[PDB]
Amino acid sequence: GKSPEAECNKITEEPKCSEEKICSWHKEVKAGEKNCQFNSTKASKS
């Protein structure tokens, strides 16, 4: 329950992440990046 970015990072699942609050699936990823991660102001839903 810390930074939302870190929160999303743990999911490591596309189906879950895509539905996760303010999380979005980084489909393509560079070696070093993270797939499930903070979508920032992408969600814009409360």
From Swiss-Prot:
Instruction: Report which residue ranges the record marks as coiled coil.
Output: none
Glycan-carrying positions: 39
Q: Where in the cell is it found?
A: Cell membrane
Q: Tell me, what does this protein do in biology?
A: VSG forms a coat on the surface of the parasite. The trypanosome evades the immune response of the host by expressing a series of antigenically distinct VSGs from an estimated 1000 VSG genes.
Tell which residues of the whole protein are contained here. Answer: 405 to 450 of 514
Judging by the UniProt lineage, the source's domain of life is Eukaryota
Query: Which named protein is this?
Result: Variant surface glycoprotein ILTAT 1.24
